[PDB]
């Protein structure tokens, strides 16, 4: 857990993208590689294609997701089963 | 050792009793090199045993030890291709060591709470010849008599 002094960490490209998207009002998915950025209230109600290392997975962010990080909703490994 | 005939290491006598036998008993009881704890246990057990069963700690300890000492044990020789269980007389120092070892292990097994209490109970029971240690001695003697037929191999 990041210290409370420093505050939550989120990436600039995603920030301009989300503020510009908030200002614009468009609903195109936001392609990002910033899995380490925490989710904010202004991001609520947006589709964000987070990179899983292979492809961009669309995550429709909701109010409950605030405080979590984008990577948590973009699983990287793909395991079905051994048998 | 194939080629070595050095004897046994000199052991110092018990501080509070001046008994080499008692010192060996403390060493056998001791675990993890914690001699202080084992020495306190044996001293308390000896005092309790003395008060209960007789006059002095050494007298009670020796009578119990004698009641546990084995005359003859059995080893596994291998001469005729198969293994023969043959009886063999035990040298006196091994008698003392086996007796003390049997007493300690029997005391550990017992279900009483304190270790000193278990040791005192087992020592008194061995003196009275109803203990697990004397049972172990009688068992080894019984098996030796059973396979005494191979006493000349």
């Amino acid at each position: 857990p990041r210290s409370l002094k420093k505050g939550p960490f989120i990436d600039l490209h995603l920030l301009k993208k989300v503020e510009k998207a908030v200002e614009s009002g468009d609903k195109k998915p936001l392609r990002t590689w910033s899995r380490r950025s925490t989710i904010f209230p202004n991001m609520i109600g947006l589709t964000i294609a987070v990179h899983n290392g292979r492809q961009h997975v669309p995550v429709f962010v909701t109010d409950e997701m605030v405080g979590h990080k984008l990577g948590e909703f973009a699983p990287t490994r793909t395991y079905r089963g051994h048998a | 050792p194939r080629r070595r005939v050095i004897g046994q290491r000199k052991i110092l006598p018990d501080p509070k009793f001046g008994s080499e036998l008692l010192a060996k008993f403390v060493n056998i009881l001791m675990v993890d090199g914690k001699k202080s704890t084992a020495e306190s246990i044996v001293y308390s057990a000896l005092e309790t045993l003395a008060q209960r069963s007789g006059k002095s700690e050494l007298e009670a300890f020796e009578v119990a030890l004698e009641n546990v000492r084995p005359t003859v044990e059995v080893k596994s020789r291998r001469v005729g291709g198969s293994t023969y269980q043959v009886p063999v007389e035990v040298r006196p120092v091994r008698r003392n060591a086996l007796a003390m070892r049997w007493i300690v292990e029997a005391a550990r097994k017992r279900g009483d709470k304190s270790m000193a209490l278990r040791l005192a109970n087992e020592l008194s029971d061995a003196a009275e010849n109803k203990g697990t240690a004397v049972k172990k001695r009688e068992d080894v003697h019984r098996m030796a008599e059973a396979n005494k037929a191979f006493a000349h191999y």
Binding site: - | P15, K16, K35, S36, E39
Partner: protein, 128 residues
């Protein structure tokens, strides 16, 4: 007066003993013998040389010991008292030797060796 001195040594401990012809007082690092050594065996080991060549109530000794543990310090104190007694009398050498107090026990430790988990404890081996 004379302040007969003796240096005792044990695995890592070093004791300095000053014997004086007085009563039977023992002062170890500005403490009584019972205060310093809670171990009854340690107390008796410190006693041992005096009891053998009877001087228990005839000598004051002032002791300072550094390093080691309880048994090591007790052994160093015993060695120092023996050396001080030998220097003081010089007739007790034979009695002290036959008791076994003059000899300095040289067993310190075996160092840990590369490849072994301890000085001699070897890692567990497997055939398959």
């Amino acid at each position: 007066e004379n302040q007969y001195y003796g240096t005792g040594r044990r695995k890592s401990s070093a004791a300095r003993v000053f014997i004086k012809p007085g009563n039977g007082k023992i002062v170890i690092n500005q403490r009584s013998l019972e205060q310093y050594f809670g171990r009854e065996t340690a107390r008796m080991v410190v006693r041992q040389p005096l009891e053998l060549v009877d001087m228990v109530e005839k000598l004051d000794l002032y002791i300072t010991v550094k390093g080691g543990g309880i048994s090591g310090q007790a052994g160093a104190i015993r060695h120092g008292i023996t050396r001080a007694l030998m220097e003081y009398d010089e007739s007790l050498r034979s009695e002290l030797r036959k008791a076994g107090f003059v000899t300095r026990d040289a067993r310190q430790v075996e160092r840990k060796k590369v490849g072994l988990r301890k000085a001699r404890r070897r890692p567990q081996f497997s055939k398959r």
